[PDB]
Amino acid sequence: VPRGSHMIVKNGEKWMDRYEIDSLIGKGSFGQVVKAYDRVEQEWVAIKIIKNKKAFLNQAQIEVRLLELMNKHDTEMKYYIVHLKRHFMFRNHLCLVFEMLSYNLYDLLRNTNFRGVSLNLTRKFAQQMCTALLFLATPELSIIHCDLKPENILLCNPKRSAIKIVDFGSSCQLGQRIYQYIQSRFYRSPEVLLGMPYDLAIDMWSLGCILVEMHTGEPLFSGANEVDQMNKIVEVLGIPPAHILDQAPKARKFFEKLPDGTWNLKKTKDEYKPPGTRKLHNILGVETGGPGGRRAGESGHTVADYLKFKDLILRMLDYDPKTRIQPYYALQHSFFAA
Ligand SMILES: O=c1[nH]cnc2n[nH]c(-c3ccccc3)c12
């Protein structure tokens, strides 16, 4: 019986006279992902190998149950989600066999040298992601992904704009509270930072952040810790509304209630732009040729196009999760008309 939790995997070895192991795609907390040729189906697959560890095996059983639930739906909307082909036990590890995809949206940004992709490509990513979220919001699914980030959104083909969401290892269904901290820090919703109840809206918050990063090349809110994260949100969006902070268990981590009942930033031990003064209008360069002026003298980047982009993002970054734009209504936004 092996001492480590990981599976030993030798490039070039062949599993069950079927999977020819090519190379390591990625490592993580969960275990590893390998590129393999399925000699039976004559196609590439990505094999996700789960650590022989109770917590990761539990997360992977949740991922299997949610992916298999999604598979039973007829709608074409399900093809924005990575397809789990099959799962088995091999050498005492749970192995998930997925369709092989191309590189993630972070890799794509790195290929631009973090200058961002065009508004037209951003629009195509946005429409596919809102469609994916509409699918997850189907009542019989009600799935919160809980870890949307550029690294979890993969191109199907390196030449094309088609994308798929991966990694439902941290996911839950509406009304569940399983893990103490959720969402990747840069993409973490205000309701999660505040310890308030969360629903499918946290995913629309993450999507708002992601789409700005895809067009500018840089994370909108790049916090080094939760206090820094909330302070960077506040630079762009202002102090959250009183009706939220009055109900937030962790309001006093970030904010203080003054004698007149109004909320301010908490005094530091002893730096940020004043609240609401880092305008998304200027981050996007609506009137000034896009990010760093680099999109003036290109087409598909008009002031009119930027205003529609800005208006949709600010609906996704609503502090109030009951009024934040829902996928069903995001898809009807004029940003998608053209
Ligand atoms: O990481 C991955 N790289 C390339 N193709 C992939 N297909 N599915 C995955 C994957 C699926 C679930 C969780 C993590 C990665 C891939």
Tab-separated table of all heavy atoms in Angstrom, residues 25-26 30 33-35 45-48 63 67 82-84 96-104 151-152 154-155 165-169, ligand 1:
chain	number	residue	atom	x	y	z
A	25	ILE	N	-1.146	17.452	-17.523
A	25	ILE	CA	-1.784	18.736	-17.914
A	25	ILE	C	-1.620	19.663	-16.724
A	25	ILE	O	-1.276	20.800	-16.927
A	25	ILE	CB	-3.275	18.563	-18.245
A	25	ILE	CG1	-3.509	17.742	-19.509
A	25	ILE	CG2	-3.961	19.917	-18.308
A	25	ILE	CD1	-4.950	17.340	-19.685
A	26	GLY	N	-1.923	19.181	-15.522
A	26	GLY	CA	-1.962	20.040	-14.335
A	26	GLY	C	-1.950	19.251	-13.046
A	26	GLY	O	-2.359	18.082	-13.038
A	30	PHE	N	-6.472	18.662	-5.360
A	30	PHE	CA	-7.364	17.489	-5.588
A	30	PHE	C	-6.564	16.249	-6.027
A	30	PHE	O	-7.102	15.126	-5.901
A	30	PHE	CB	-8.442	17.824	-6.630
A	30	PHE	CG	-7.891	18.171	-7.991
A	30	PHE	CD1	-7.463	17.181	-8.864
A	30	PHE	CD2	-7.759	19.494	-8.385
A	30	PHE	CE1	-6.914	17.502	-10.098
A	30	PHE	CE2	-7.214	19.816	-9.621
A	30	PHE	CZ	-6.785	18.819	-10.470
A	33	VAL	N	-4.185	15.981	-13.268
A	33	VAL	CA	-4.897	15.813	-14.558
A	33	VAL	C	-3.877	15.411	-15.620
A	33	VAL	O	-2.885	16.148	-15.798
A	33	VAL	CB	-5.639	17.093	-14.944
A	33	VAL	CG1	-6.381	16.909	-16.258
A	33	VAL	CG2	-6.620	17.499	-13.867
A	34	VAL	N	-4.127	14.302	-16.328
A	34	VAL	CA	-3.198	13.834	-17.392
A	34	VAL	C	-3.907	13.801	-18.743
A	34	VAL	O	-5.115	13.564	-18.795
A	34	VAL	CB	-2.576	12.479	-17.024
A	34	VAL	CG1	-1.831	12.561	-15.704
A	34	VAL	CG2	-3.625	11.394	-16.960
A	35	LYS	N	-3.136	14.067	-19.792
A	35	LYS	CA	-3.519	13.918	-21.204
A	35	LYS	C	-3.273	12.463	-21.614
A	35	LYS	O	-2.168	11.923	-21.383
A	35	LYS	CB	-2.725	14.909	-22.043
A	35	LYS	CG	-3.203	15.016	-23.470
A	35	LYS	CD	-2.300	15.884	-24.291
A	35	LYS	CE	-2.644	15.809	-25.759
A	35	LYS	NZ	-1.759	16.698	-26.529
A	45	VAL	N	-8.361	12.258	-24.270
A	45	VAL	CA	-9.135	12.536	-23.036
A	45	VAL	C	-8.224	13.211	-22.008
A	45	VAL	O	-6.997	13.077	-22.086
A	45	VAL	CB	-9.777	11.264	-22.470
A	45	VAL	CG1	-10.783	10.679	-23.431
A	45	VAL	CG2	-8.733	10.221	-22.097
A	46	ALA	N	-8.829	13.951	-21.084
A	46	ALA	CA	-8.144	14.508	-19.896
A	46	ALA	C	-8.588	13.664	-18.709
A	46	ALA	O	-9.802	13.617	-18.446
A	46	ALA	CB	-8.499	15.971	-19.715
A	47	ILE	N	-7.673	12.967	-18.059
A	47	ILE	CA	-8.047	12.102	-16.915
A	47	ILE	C	-7.727	12.857	-15.635
A	47	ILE	O	-6.582	13.182	-15.415
A	47	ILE	CB	-7.399	10.714	-16.979
A	47	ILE	CG1	-7.736	10.028	-18.298
A	47	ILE	CG2	-7.863	9.873	-15.789
A	47	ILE	CD1	-7.155	8.649	-18.427
A	48	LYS	N	-8.747	13.146	-14.849
A	48	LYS	CA	-8.572	13.783	-13.528
A	48	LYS	C	-8.423	12.674	-12.485
A	48	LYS	O	-9.400	11.922	-12.284
A	48	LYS	CB	-9.765	14.675	-13.185
A	48	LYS	CG	-9.632	15.452	-11.896
A	48	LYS	CD	-10.780	16.421	-11.700
A	48	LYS	CE	-10.596	17.339	-10.519
A	48	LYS	NZ	-11.762	18.250	-10.391
A	63	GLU	N	-18.711	16.256	-7.509
A	63	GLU	CA	-18.448	16.617	-8.914
A	63	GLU	C	-19.059	15.562	-9.843
A	63	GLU	O	-19.785	15.944	-10.797
A	63	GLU	CB	-16.953	16.826	-9.152
A	63	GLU	CG	-16.659	17.264	-10.569
A	63	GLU	CD	-15.257	17.788	-10.870
A	63	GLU	OE1	-14.275	17.252	-10.264
A	63	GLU	OE2	-15.154	18.738	-11.721
A	67	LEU	N	-22.108	16.630	-12.408
A	67	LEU	CA	-21.862	16.472	-13.856
A	67	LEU	C	-22.847	15.465	-14.463
A	67	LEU	O	-23.397	15.743	-15.573
A	67	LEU	CB	-20.411	16.066	-14.044
A	67	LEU	CG	-19.436	17.200	-13.731
A	67	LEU	CD1	-18.014	16.707	-13.777
A	67	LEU	CD2	-19.627	18.369	-14.691
A	82	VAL	N	-18.032	21.281	-19.310
A	82	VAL	CA	-17.138	20.174	-19.738
A	82	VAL	C	-17.873	18.836	-19.555
A	82	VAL	O	-18.564	18.650	-18.550
A	82	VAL	CB	-15.813	20.161	-18.972
A	82	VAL	CG1	-16.039	19.870	-17.498
A	82	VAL	CG2	-14.864	19.167	-19.604
A	83	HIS	N	-17.695	17.924	-20.520
A	83	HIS	CA	-18.414	16.636	-20.571
A	83	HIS	C	-17.594	15.562	-19.853
A	83	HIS	O	-16.481	15.274	-20.320
A	83	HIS	CB	-18.741	16.225	-22.010
A	83	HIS	CG	-19.522	14.957	-22.079
A	83	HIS	ND1	-19.091	13.858	-22.799
A	83	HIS	CD2	-20.661	14.584	-21.462
A	83	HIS	CE1	-19.952	12.875	-22.666
A	83	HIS	NE2	-20.936	13.297	-21.849
A	84	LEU	N	-18.139	15.017	-18.773
A	84	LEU	CA	-17.578	13.834	-18.077
A	84	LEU	C	-17.996	12.598	-18.861
A	84	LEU	O	-19.186	12.313	-18.897
A	84	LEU	CB	-18.140	13.742	-16.653
A	84	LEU	CG	-17.652	12.531	-15.840
A	84	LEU	CD1	-16.183	12.677	-15.505
A	84	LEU	CD2	-18.457	12.349	-14.587
A	96	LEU	N	-11.653	10.472	-13.166
A	96	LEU	CA	-12.716	11.102	-13.979
A	96	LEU	C	-12.170	11.336	-15.389
A	96	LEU	O	-11.168	12.059	-15.543
A	96	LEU	CB	-13.143	12.426	-13.342
A	96	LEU	CG	-14.138	12.326	-12.188
A	96	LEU	CD1	-13.582	11.559	-11.011
A	96	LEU	CD2	-14.546	13.712	-11.727
A	97	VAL	N	-12.825	10.773	-16.390
A	97	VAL	CA	-12.404	10.911	-17.804
A	97	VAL	C	-13.276	12.002	-18.430
A	97	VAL	O	-14.501	11.825	-18.527
A	97	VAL	CB	-12.487	9.598	-18.591
A	97	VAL	CG1	-11.910	9.776	-19.991
A	97	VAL	CG2	-11.769	8.459	-17.858
A	98	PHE	N	-12.646	13.088	-18.845
A	98	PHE	CA	-13.317	14.238	-19.495
A	98	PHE	C	-12.902	14.332	-20.952
A	98	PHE	O	-11.834	13.849	-21.299
A	98	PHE	CB	-12.904	15.519	-18.800
A	98	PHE	CG	-13.428	15.681	-17.402
A	98	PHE	CD1	-12.624	15.359	-16.318
A	98	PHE	CD2	-14.695	16.197	-17.166
A	98	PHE	CE1	-13.071	15.554	-15.021
A	98	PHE	CE2	-15.146	16.382	-15.867
A	98	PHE	CZ	-14.334	16.079	-14.792
A	99	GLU	N	-13.704	15.007	-21.770
A	99	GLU	CA	-13.299	15.415	-23.141
A	99	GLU	C	-12.048	16.300	-23.050
A	99	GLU	O	-11.888	17.057	-22.058
A	99	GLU	CB	-14.417	16.155	-23.885
A	99	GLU	CG	-14.869	17.399	-23.166
A	99	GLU	CD	-15.982	18.177	-23.845
A	99	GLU	OE1	-15.922	18.337	-25.048
A	99	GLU	OE2	-16.899	18.629	-23.154
A	100	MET	N	-11.166	16.197	-24.040
A	100	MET	CA	-9.928	16.994	-24.042
A	100	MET	C	-10.269	18.391	-24.560
A	100	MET	O	-10.840	18.487	-25.640
A	100	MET	CB	-8.850	16.401	-24.940
A	100	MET	CG	-7.583	17.213	-24.889
A	100	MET	SD	-6.715	16.862	-23.362
A	100	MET	CE	-5.696	18.332	-23.209
A	101	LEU	N	-9.871	19.424	-23.832
A	101	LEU	CA	-10.104	20.825	-24.243
A	101	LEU	C	-8.747	21.483	-24.495
A	101	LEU	O	-7.730	20.801	-24.396
A	101	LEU	CB	-10.909	21.524	-23.143
A	101	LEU	CG	-12.306	20.957	-22.917
A	101	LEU	CD1	-13.024	21.690	-21.790
A	101	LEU	CD2	-13.125	21.017	-24.194
A	102	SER	N	-8.738	22.758	-24.857
A	102	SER	CA	-7.494	23.510	-25.168
A	102	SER	C	-7.085	24.326	-23.927
A	102	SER	O	-7.386	23.898	-22.799
A	102	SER	CB	-7.690	24.355	-26.424
A	102	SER	OG	-6.479	24.994	-26.801
A	103	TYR	N	-6.414	25.463	-24.084
A	103	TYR	CA	-5.865	26.178	-22.898
A	103	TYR	C	-6.935	27.107	-22.284
A	103	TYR	O	-8.004	27.345	-22.856
A	103	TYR	CB	-4.527	26.845	-23.216
A	103	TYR	CG	-4.526	27.684	-24.453
A	103	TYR	CD1	-5.093	28.948	-24.438
A	103	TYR	CD2	-3.960	27.214	-25.632
A	103	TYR	CE1	-5.114	29.731	-25.582
A	103	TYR	CE2	-3.977	27.985	-26.786
A	103	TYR	CZ	-4.558	29.250	-26.759
A	103	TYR	OH	-4.600	30.057	-27.866
A	104	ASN	N	-6.667	27.577	-21.072
A	104	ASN	CA	-7.641	28.359	-20.264
A	104	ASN	C	-7.488	29.859	-20.579
A	104	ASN	O	-6.545	30.251	-21.307
A	104	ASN	CB	-7.527	28.018	-18.780
A	104	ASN	CG	-6.213	28.444	-18.175
A	104	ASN	OD1	-5.784	29.584	-18.337
A	104	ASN	ND2	-5.596	27.545	-17.423
A	151	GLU	N	-8.819	30.634	-15.051
A	151	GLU	CA	-8.165	29.304	-15.125
A	151	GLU	C	-9.222	28.208	-15.224
A	151	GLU	O	-8.855	27.157	-15.709
A	151	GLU	CB	-7.280	29.051	-13.914
A	151	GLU	CG	-6.022	29.889	-13.876
A	151	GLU	CD	-6.073	31.265	-13.204
A	151	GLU	OE1	-7.185	31.862	-13.051
A	151	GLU	OE2	-4.978	31.761	-12.876
A	152	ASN	N	-10.495	28.452	-14.848
A	152	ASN	CA	-11.562	27.409	-14.926
A	152	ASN	C	-12.408	27.496	-16.196
A	152	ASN	O	-13.439	26.791	-16.284
A	152	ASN	CB	-12.402	27.433	-13.653
A	152	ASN	CG	-11.649	26.694	-12.579
A	152	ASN	OD1	-10.810	25.867	-12.929
A	152	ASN	ND2	-11.975	26.914	-11.317
A	154	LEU	N	-12.140	27.114	-20.278
A	154	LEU	CA	-11.178	26.603	-21.274
A	154	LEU	C	-11.739	26.801	-22.675
A	154	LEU	O	-12.953	26.572	-22.896
A	154	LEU	CB	-10.898	25.125	-20.985
A	154	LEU	CG	-9.762	24.857	-20.015
A	154	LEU	CD1	-10.145	25.331	-18.636
A	154	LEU	CD2	-9.420	23.372	-20.003
A	155	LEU	N	-10.869	27.140	-23.606
A	155	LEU	CA	-11.210	27.094	-25.050
A	155	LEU	C	-11.397	25.628	-25.465
A	155	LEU	O	-10.619	24.786	-24.999
A	155	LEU	CB	-10.062	27.711	-25.849
A	155	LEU	CG	-9.878	29.219	-25.751
A	155	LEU	CD1	-8.628	29.622	-26.516
A	155	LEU	CD2	-11.101	29.975	-26.292
A	165	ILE	N	-16.871	25.632	-19.162
A	165	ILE	CA	-16.556	25.721	-17.712
A	165	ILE	C	-16.069	24.348	-17.231
A	165	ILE	O	-16.704	23.337	-17.594
A	165	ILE	CB	-17.790	26.236	-16.959
A	165	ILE	CG1	-18.191	27.618	-17.474
A	165	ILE	CG2	-17.487	26.239	-15.488
A	165	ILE	CD1	-19.404	28.199	-16.768
A	166	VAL	N	-15.006	24.318	-16.428
A	166	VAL	CA	-14.482	23.070	-15.808
A	166	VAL	C	-14.446	23.225	-14.296
A	166	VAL	O	-14.567	24.383	-13.812
A	166	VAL	CB	-13.068	22.750	-16.311
A	166	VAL	CG1	-13.013	22.673	-17.837
A	166	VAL	CG2	-12.050	23.762	-15.774
A	167	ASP	N	-14.192	22.107	-13.606
A	167	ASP	CA	-13.905	21.992	-12.158
A	167	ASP	C	-15.108	22.382	-11.275
A	167	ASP	O	-15.071	23.464	-10.656
A	167	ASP	CB	-12.684	22.816	-11.761
A	167	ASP	CG	-12.155	22.417	-10.394
A	167	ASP	OD1	-12.830	21.580	-9.720
A	167	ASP	OD2	-11.053	22.898	-10.037
A	168	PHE	N	-16.021	21.435	-11.043
A	168	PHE	CA	-17.174	21.573	-10.122
A	168	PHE	C	-16.835	20.912	-8.791
A	168	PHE	O	-17.778	20.570	-8.055
A	168	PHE	CB	-18.441	21.030	-10.800
A	168	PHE	CG	-18.948	21.884	-11.939
A	168	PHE	CD1	-18.305	21.881	-13.168
A	168	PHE	CD2	-20.041	22.716	-11.775
A	168	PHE	CE1	-18.731	22.705	-14.198
A	168	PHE	CE2	-20.486	23.511	-12.826
A	168	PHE	CZ	-19.830	23.498	-14.037
A	169	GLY	N	-15.536	20.786	-8.474
A	169	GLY	CA	-15.041	20.198	-7.215
A	169	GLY	C	-15.433	21.002	-5.971
A	169	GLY	O	-15.532	20.399	-4.860
B	1	LIG	O1	-7.583	20.765	-17.190
B	1	LIG	C1	-7.972	20.399	-18.313
B	1	LIG	N1	-7.191	20.658	-19.431
B	1	LIG	C2	-7.520	20.296	-20.686
B	1	LIG	N2	-8.619	19.668	-21.018
B	1	LIG	C3	-9.435	19.419	-19.953
B	1	LIG	N3	-10.632	18.820	-19.970
B	1	LIG	N4	-11.129	18.751	-18.715
B	1	LIG	C4	-10.243	19.281	-17.883
B	1	LIG	C5	-10.617	19.370	-16.469
B	1	LIG	C6	-11.874	18.913	-16.055
B	1	LIG	C7	-12.296	19.069	-14.738
B	1	LIG	C8	-11.457	19.671	-13.816
B	1	LIG	C9	-10.225	20.154	-14.221
B	1	LIG	C10	-9.815	20.033	-15.547
B	1	LIG	C11	-9.160	19.739	-18.604
